[PDB]
Amino acid sequence: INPVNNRIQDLTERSDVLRGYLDYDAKKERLEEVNAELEQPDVWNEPERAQALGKERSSLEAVVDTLDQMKQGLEDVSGLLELAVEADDEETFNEAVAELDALEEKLAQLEFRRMFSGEYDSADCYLDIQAGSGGTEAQDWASMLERMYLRWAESRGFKTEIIEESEGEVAGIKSVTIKISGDYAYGWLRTETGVHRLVRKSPFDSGGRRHTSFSSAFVYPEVDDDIDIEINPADLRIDVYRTSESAVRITHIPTGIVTQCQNDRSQHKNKDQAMKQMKAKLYELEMQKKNAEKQGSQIRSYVLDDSRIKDLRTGVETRNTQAVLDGSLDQFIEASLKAGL
Amino acid sequence: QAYVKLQVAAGMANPSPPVGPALGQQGVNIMEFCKAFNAKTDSIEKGLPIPVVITVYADRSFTFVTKTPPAAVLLKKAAGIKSGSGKPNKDKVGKISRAQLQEIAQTKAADMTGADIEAMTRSIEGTARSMGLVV
Amino acid sequence: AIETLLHDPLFRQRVEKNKKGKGSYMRKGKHG
């Protein structure tokens, strides 16, 4: 029974948290005005507007209505439990124990929905880790980052694959494209776009000086065969180069951004892949622009000397640096998601 | 004379956001209809929707006779499911027994314009199938 | 424009000046 007891309160707490996150009062207010408008018969004369209003209302009701249900459902559960306690009957107790699960599940689902607001969160994505300016150290850092990300993916249950890798002459990697694959990958990883500041004492340096390196990650979802926009054949440049004949680089002239592929064996396959990547990138850029219209790049700082990692924007610190490196970065990502940046 | 069935759950008194102008399009007031609905409810269980005849006379005093609860909701209730099915032939969400369906059928008989309950049962079965539940 | 962003001086590899080692020597301390 102790676990059951624990579950009643915990669920309630999480519901409360969810409500807080929502900032439900505003939503309620919106619903109210909207409801009033709907009630007025002159709104339906203009059809499109009316439709829009209707659309607005229902969601508002439903989020709020869901919350209400949770509040009420929880209460009911509590009452049931109390009843069971009072009247020493097994069946009632069992019922009390059980009924709560469903509510919890519902709550979880709601939370998930809230989290993944964007349209392309569900789809798989292309992580892209490019090393810093510095030199060898930067490359090393990039490599480390890549390793971390792959481990994270593995932990999740994601199918990783290296689309492109460019190696650093001494050590590490100059740059690397990685295709992750699985359910809602982009929804997690889209937050982790940006620059990552490594700060450590350089083993590649002869002296024991403390170096500060950077590396960008850039994440974009796979949008092939669904999206209507296509690259203009004149703006698209194809280019071939040697593996490390097979590989293919693509270039776009107006925006001035490139994408490549070397994983496939023949040229044709590679080119197609590149095209796919490029279009996705374009889509991402367009959406970003849109967002901006509607409306520094460093996201995390890994300080390995003092042994603290601190996501900058969210403001969450952890000292288990090694763990984080090994792919225990879920915590940061979820925080980021919650924040809604 | 302006007769249409268009409403939600019986327990929700004065459903203005679901229905709104549809009930109060004609000269009859929004208060009255809701009140009537409430009155009707006291003899039966809350939670479920209920349709009713809306013969809107010129005197602003309407006659009304309730019908049986919605076919769908009743069907659902014996099944024990909230969401029915999305893409039912590809994968099955649930399933129903015929006896239960038959039982369900018999209780509606007053509103059902038909002598044979067998027919009703088969209709119910068909409906269930459509929804996405192989009998 | 990610490569250009990485290029900016903002993100150039800093190296912390020594206090006891090679570049140790300060002619004048932070305070007298």
Curated annotation (Swiss-Prot), chain A:
UniProt keyword annotation of Protein biosynthesis present: yes
Main localization (coarse): cytoplasm
Keyword set, alphabetical order: Cytoplasm, Methylation, Protein biosynthesis
Reported effect, residue 202 to P: No longer forms a detectable complex with TnaC-stalled 70S ribosomes
Pfam family, one: PCRF
GO BP annotations, alphabetical order: translational termination; viral translational frameshifting
Location in or out of the cell: Cytoplasm
Listed SUPFAM superfamilies: Release factor
Record SMART domains: PCRF
Source species, domain of life: Bacteria
UniProt keyword Protein biosynthesis, yes or no: yes
Note in the entry: The gene for this protein contains a UGA in-frame termination codon after Leu-22; a naturally occurring frameshift enables complete translation of RF-2. This provides a mechanism for the protein to regulate its own production.
Subunit (UniProt): Interacts with the ribosome. Recruited to stalled ribosomes by ArfA, in the presence of truncated mRNA, ArfA influences RF2 conformation so RF2 can hydrolyze the peptidyl-tRNA bond. Biotinylated tnaC mRNA can be detected in a stalled 70S ribosome-RF2-TnaC-tRNA(Pro) complex.
Job description of the protein: Peptide chain release factor 2 directs the termination of translation in response to the peptide chain termination codons UGA and UAA. Acts as a peptidyl-tRNA hydrolase. In the presence of truncated mRNA in the 70S ribosome, ArfA and RF2 interact such that the GGQ peptide hydrolysis motif of RF2 rises into the peptidyl-transferase center (PTC) and releases the ribosome. Recruited by ArfA to rescue stalled ribosomes in the absence of a normal stop codon. A TnaC-stalled ribosome binds RF2, but the active GGQ motif is prevented from engaging with the PTC by TnaC.
Family: Belongs to the prokaryotic/mitochondrial release factor family.
Record protein name field: Peptide chain release factor RF2
Organism from which the protein derives: Escherichia coli (strain K12)
Curated annotation (Swiss-Prot), chain B:
Protein name: Large ribosomal subunit protein uL11
Gene3D superfamilies: Ribosomal protein L11, C-terminal domain, Ribosomal protein L11/L12, N-terminal domain
Its biological purpose: Forms part of the ribosomal stalk which helps the ribosome interact with GTP-bound translation factors.
Domain of life from the UniProt record: Bacteria
GO terms (BP aspect): cytoplasmic translation; ribosomal large subunit assembly; stringent response; translation; translational termination
Subunit structure: Part of the ribosomal stalk of the 50S ribosomal subunit. Interacts with L10 and the large rRNA to form the base of the stalk. L10 forms an elongated spine to which 2 L12 dimers bind in a sequential fashion forming a pentameric L10(L12)2(L12)2 complex.
Record SMART domains: RL11 (SM00649)
UniProt keyword terms in alphabetical order: Methylation, Ribonucleoprotein, Ribosomal protein, RNA-binding, rRNA-binding
Residue numbers bearing the N6-succinyllysine modification: 67, 76
Swiss-Prot record, chain C:
Signal sequence coordinates: none
Region (Disordered): 16-32
Coiled-coil intervals, chain numbering: none
Disruption outcome: Cells lacking this gene are viable, but those lacking both arfA and ssrA are non-viable.
Biased composition (Basic residues): 19-32
Top-level lineage group: Bacteria
UniProt effect for mutating residue 27 to C: About 20% ribosome rescue activity, initial rate
TM helices/strands, residue ranges: none
Complexes and interactors: Interacts with the 50S ribosomal subunit. Interacts with RF2/PrfB on the ribosome. Contacts ribosomal protein S12 (rpsL).
Family of the protein in this entry: Belongs to the alternative ribosome-rescue factor A family.
Role according to the record: Rescues ribosomes stalled at the 3' end of non-stop mRNAs. This activity is crucial when the stalled ribosome cannot be rescued by the SsrA(tmRNA)-SmpB quality control system. Binds the 30S subunit, contacting 16S rRNA with the N-terminus near the decoding center and its C-terminus in the mRNA entry channel; contacts change in the presence of release factor 2 (RF2, also named PrfB). Requires RF2/PrfB to hydrolyze stalled peptidyl-tRNA on the ribosome; recruits and probably helps position RF2/PrfB correctly in the ribosomal A site so RF2's GGQ motif can hydrolyze the peptidyl-tRNA bond.
Further remark: Active protein is only produced when SsrA(tmRNA)-SmpB-mediated trans translation is limited. ArfA can be synthesized from truncated mRNA, via ribonuclease 3 and the SsrA tagging system. In the presence of SsrA, the stalled ribosome is rescued and the incomplete nascent ArfA is tagged for degradation. In the absence of SsrA, truncated ArfA chains are released from the ribosome and are functional.
Protein name: Alternative ribosome-rescue factor A
Organism of derivation: Escherichia coli (strain K12)
Lineage: Bacteria, Pseudomonadati, Pseudomonadota, Gammaproteobacteria, Enterobacterales
Full-protein positions shown: 15 to 46 of 72
